[PDB]
DNA sequence: TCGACGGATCC
DNA sequence: GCTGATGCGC
DNA sequence: GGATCCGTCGATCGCATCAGC
C-alpha cells in the first residue's frame, strides 16, 4: 500500500520541547538536486543540520548556491580520494561543531568520501553513505568488511560520547522495511549478510532504530524508490535511510520523520528531533 | 522491478 | 561545448 | 500435452565521468 507520514511530534517523552533538528537527505547527484530545486525544500524544512549523501561533486565543482544559505554557514564536505564524480558526503551546520573529521579511521574503508563526524556539547553526529553491495553482489565481500570496521569505530565512538549515526546505511533491515521482501534476499542492501550486519550494530554499539522504536509495526515507510519501473509512483520502495541513536538519547527522542513527499532524488529526506 | 524466458512439474 | 560510451546504483 | 508453478536474467531511469575533438 501507500504511505503517509503521521504529524511531527516537536515534545519530548518528557514533554521537553525539541531543541535540535537534523536532517538527512541522499541527494544522488548534489548538483542535479540543487537543479530539482531540493535546497527550497530543504530552506522551507529550517533543520539545524543537515547531511548529505552521494553528493557526486567534488569540493571545487560545489554550487554557489550552498554559500548562500545562511542558516548552514559551517559546512563540511568529503569526497573520494581518486574516484570522480562518486559516493561523497557534506554536513551542514547552523552551530559551528566542536570538532570535525574524516573517515572511520581505516585506511581501506577512508578513500570513498562516505562519513563525516562532527562532535557537539551533548551528543556526536555520524553521517554517512555506507556502501552498495554491489549488482550481482559484487561488493559484498567488501561490504562485510566495512560493516565490522564501522561497527567497531562507533562503539568507540559511542563510549565517549551519546552518538547519533544518520544516512544512507544501504541496508532494509527486516522485512517490513521494503515492499518486495521475498525477491530480494539475494540483491543488493537485503542479504542476510547485510541484515545480519545492521542487528549487530544495533546490538554492538548499541544503537536503536529511531523510526522504528517510534513505529514498530508500520509497514510501507520507505526512504528509497529506485527511478525505475515507477517504483515511487506504487510506493514500491526502500527504509535505507536512518537516524540510529545511543539509548541514552532515547528520552530525547522527539519524532523520526520520513519526508515522502519532498522531491529531488531517488531518496526521500528523514527529519530526525531531539529534545537537547 | 519486471518480464520474458526456461525447465521443470502439477491435473 | 558537444557526441558517444562507460560506471554506478537499492 | 496444456495449463499452471518457480527459479534466472536481461532492460527498464538517472547522474556523472571519460575519450576525443
Ligand atoms: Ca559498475
Known amino acids: 500500500a501507500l504511505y503517509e507520514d503521521p504529524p511531527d511530534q516537536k515534545t519530548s517523552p518528557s514533554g521537553k520541547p525539541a531543541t535540535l533538528k537534523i536532517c538527512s537527505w541522499n541527494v544522488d547527484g548534489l548538483r542535479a538536486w540543487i537543479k530539482k530545486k531540493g535546497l527550497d525544500w530543504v530552506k522551507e524544512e529550517a533543520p539545524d543540520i543537515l547531511c548529505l549523501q552521494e553528493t557526486k561533486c567534488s569540493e571545487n565543482k560545489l554550487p554557489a548556491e550552498l554559500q548562500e544559505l545562511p542558516g548552514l554557514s559551517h559546512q563540511y564536505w ?14 551542514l551546520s547552523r552551530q559551528c561543531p566542536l570538532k570535525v573529521s574524516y573517515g572511520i579511521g581505516d585506511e581501506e574503508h577512508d578513500q570513498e568520501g562516505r562519513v563525516i563526524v562532527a562532535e557537539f556539547d551533548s551528543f556526536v553526529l555520524v553521517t554517512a553513505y555506507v556502501p552498495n553491495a554491489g549488482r550481482g553482489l559484487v561488493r559484498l565481500e567488501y561490504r562485510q568488511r566495512w560493516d565490522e570496521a564501522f561497527r567497531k569505530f562507533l562503539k568507540g565512538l559511542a563510549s565517549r560520547k551519546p552518538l547519533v549515526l544518520c544516512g544512507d546505511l544501504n ?26 550486519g545492521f542487528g549487530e550494530l544495533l546490538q554492538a554499539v548499541p544503537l536503536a532504530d529511531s523510526f522504528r522504536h517510534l513505529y514498530p509495526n508500520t509497514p510501507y515507510a520507505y526512504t528509497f ?28 527522542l522527539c519524532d523520526s520523520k520520513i519526508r515522502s513527499k519532498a522531491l529531488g532524488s531517488d531518496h526521500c529526506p528523514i527529519t530526525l528531533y531531539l529534545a537537547l
Open 225 to 252: 524508490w529506485t527511478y525505475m519501473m515507477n517504483a515511487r509512483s506504487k510506493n514500491v520502495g526502500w527504509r535505507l535511510d536512518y537516524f540510529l541513536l545511543s539509548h541514552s538519547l532515547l528520552p530525547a
Open 171 to 196: 541496508v532494509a533491515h527486516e522485512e517490513i522495511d521494503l515492499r518486495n521482501p521475498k525477491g530480494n534476499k539475494k540483491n543488493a542492501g537485503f542479504t542476510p549478510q547485510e541484515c545480519q
Open 78 to 91: 568529503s569526497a573520494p580520494s581518486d574516484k570522480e564524480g562518486y559516493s561523497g558526503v557534506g554536513l
